[PDB]
Symmetry: D2
Subunit: 98 residues, 4 copies
């Protein structure tokens, strides 16, 4: 990485009803192809790594799901700072989660 950040992604296919886990699992598999730390939770997936890699993984993940459906709503949230390292563990420690 050159410019590390911490992010969270959510990819939701529309028009396929409520059972969409099969599509979401596909998106998660996409992130794992990149040089990123992947921590999936029940409402999205947190990523740690190069900003460009995250942007590319986000687009691919979104696009992969869209390939199987007609509409997808995807969200990408980036948290980047200059005063400290941008890592998952640092954020967790800062709030006493470790």
């Amino acid at each position: 990485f050159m410019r590390k950040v911490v992010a969270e992604v959510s990819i939701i296919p529309l028009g396929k009803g409520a059972s969409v886990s099969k599509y979401v699992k596909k998106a998660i598999e996409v992130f794992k192809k990149y040089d990123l730390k992947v921590e999936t939770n029940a409402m999205g997936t947190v990523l740690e790594g190069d900003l460009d890699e995250i942007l590319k993984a986000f687009k691919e993940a979104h696009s992969t799901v869209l390939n199987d459906v007609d509409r997808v709503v995807s969200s990408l949230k980036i948290d980047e700072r200059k005063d400290k390292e941008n890592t998952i563990e640092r954020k967790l420690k800062a709030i006493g989660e470790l």
Copy 2:
């Protein structure tokens, strides 16, 4: 006796105090322990599982707790609810093989 279970995610961001906002966020998270909710904090937000009304109240309090020490706060609440299957963190994670 009445449980309308949903899974949600909350993020509270205090503004005007620079980059170091963890001290405020920690306080907001503490609030959740007072409610009958499952709490799973991650690096970008806090996932909650429990009654919808309880999550709405916990959200308002967490938001307000931070606003007490800062001048401005931007808070987000996302709700995921379905009526065909149980709304639990465990089931969602199992469904995608994370458990």
Copy 3:
């Protein structure tokens, strides 16, 4: 009165292509409350009491859930205590009014 400016986005997960149909229903719900409502292409901005917004949010979400099996709704709140916060004030502060 505890005024805030907020944004609500509701995603209904159905098997048809028209979601706007259900979202329109959610927007009508907002209008039953004492709130200023400004809908845009990605969500609806609300201005009014925090409690009223929380109630309106819950009802809008629930109304859509009555038509589809799953709904993902988001509520974002921007509250400040140093100044009065309103839709028009926020817009003018950035020269977008």
Copy 4:
């Protein structure tokens, strides 16, 4: 605008700096978006964009980065709504929602 893959999006660039006021930084981000080949419609909680997906991703990164140059931390969000069965435009969504 010029595109190969049009989508409708909403962005919010939140600077974590000194003082509750962030208007200066927010306007800076908005000016960045306007420099790209996109339709820009700012509302009180975010900025809606219409244009090519890649142009939006580029604009997003630059807006986020330009704000980060002035403050020590930035939390930026991008939400994309893309469909293949109908055109992805602000106008269509507004007409479909009863606003136009």
